[PDB]
Design an enzyme around this catalytic site. Structure first.
Site, PDB file in Angstrom:
ATOM      1  N   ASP A  35      14.024 -17.613 -19.579  1.00 20.08           N
ATOM      2  CA  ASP A  35      14.142 -17.374 -18.139  1.00 20.08           C
ATOM      3  C   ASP A  35      14.681 -18.606 -17.416  1.00 20.08           C
ATOM      4  OD1 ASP A  35      13.901 -16.488 -15.566  1.00 20.08           O
ATOM      5  OD2 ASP A  35      11.709 -16.600 -15.472  1.00 20.08           O
ATOM      6  N   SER A 199      29.276 -18.910  -5.670  1.00 18.53           N
ATOM      7  CA  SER A 199      30.404 -18.081  -6.059  1.00 18.53           C
ATOM      8  C   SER A 199      31.454 -18.079  -4.946  1.00 18.53           C
ATOM      9  CB  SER A 199      29.930 -16.654  -6.333  1.00 18.53           C
ATOM     10  OG  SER A 199      31.018 -15.779  -6.572  1.00 18.53           O
TER      11      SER A 199
END
Length: 330
Positions: A35, A199
């Site tokens: 994770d 992004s």
């Protein structure tokens, strides 16, 4: 040193991936959920409340010659999905894919919430976010990667998750045969303890790419892609019959639909998520309505590039002094 381990989906939907991890002496092999959105390595154990164990493999520290109890230490974690676990703390020898860390904090669960009990395939979590998120008290403990870092040939790990198939976590090297084209690297902020990056935009299907900054985290422990409501609405508007359902808890669409791809930007590069990756199947058994793999992050407080996004890429988690993320197509 290096390590290399195969990671395998837990079910036919890629809800999560499990990776075998050797703990203790002699080795006890548990299948952990790696994770990159958390920083605790915790396991089902001989100390876990019996009624909360249902099919998991447990770590038994009393059978390990190298286990040490960290005196007085406790831990307690809550995850984004409302799940939680807590307990006490050992250190022990932990190996992943041939890479060994001695004295790794192994957090032994005394209590786990129902979602963990109900998932017999996940024996615990191995956190790969920054050690500043670790929940051990009174003294925070280091992640497996943080402990391994100095010994690695290169201070990196890579995630290469498969679509409906196994993939790979590598530590200490970049497998240049595992991707196409080049890896584009992008800046990381560690301010919130995550692999947080920006992004450069998105496209829906064959649409023209929209240049816009989208801050979010690279999180292998989250199944879906959670993005701003504007972006998500633009995606589902291109799917006939799709709609947001408050009763189901997200966007749903007719299972017979052909889903468009979704593209996200990494610098000037682009990662294309095929439409099929966005199908999470019937909302309930036998339904002709299916659950979408791109959902709104509104109310989470952060955008999350989870498995739906990451499995479309070869992803480099560069833990150099100034951390970065790399993405390549594959």
């Amino acid at each position: 040193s290096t390590g290399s381990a195969t990671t395998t989906p837990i079910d036919s939907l890629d809800d999560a991936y499990i990776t075998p991890v050797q703990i203790g002496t002699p080795a006890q092999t548990l299948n952990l959920d790696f994770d990159t959105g958390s920083s605790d390595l915790w396991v089902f154990s001989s100390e876990t409340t019996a009624s909360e164990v249902d099919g998991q493999t447990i770590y038994t520290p009393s059978k390990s010659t190298t286990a040490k109890l960290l005196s007085g230490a406790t831990w307690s974690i809550s995850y984004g999905d409302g799940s939680s676990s807590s307990g006490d703390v050992y250190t022990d020898t932990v190996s992943v894919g041939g890479l060994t860390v001695t004295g790794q904090a192994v957090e032994s669960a005394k209590k786990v919430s129902s979602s963990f009990t109900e998932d017999s395939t996940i024996d615990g979590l191995l956190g790969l976010a920054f050690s500043t998120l670790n929940t051990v008290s009174p003294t925070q403990q280091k992640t497996f990667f943080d402990n391994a870092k100095a010994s690695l040939d290169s201070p990196v790990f890579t995630a290469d998750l498969g679509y409906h198939a196994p993939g790979t976590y590598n530590f200490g090297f970049i497998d240049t045969t595992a991707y196409t084209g080049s890896i584009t690297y992008t800046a990381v902020s560690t301010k919130q303890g995550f692999w947080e990056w920006t992004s450069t935009g998105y496209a829906v299907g064959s649409g023209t790419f929209k240049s816009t900054s989208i801050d979010g985290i690279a999180d292998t422990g989250t199944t879906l892609l959670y993005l701003p409501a504007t972006v998500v609405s633009a995606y589902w508007a291109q799917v006939s019959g799709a709609k947001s359902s408050s009763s189901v808890g997200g966007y749903v669409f007719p299972c017979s639909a052909t889903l468009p791809s979704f593209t996200f930007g990494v610098g000037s590069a682009r990662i294309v998520i095929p439409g099929d990756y966005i199908d999470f199947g019937p909302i309930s058994t036998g339904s002709s309505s299916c659950f979408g793999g791109i959902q709104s992050s509104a109310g989470i407080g952060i955008n999350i590039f989870g498995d739906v996004a990451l499995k479309a890429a070869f992803v480099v988690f560069n833990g150099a002094t100034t951390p970065t993320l790399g993405f390549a197509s594959k």
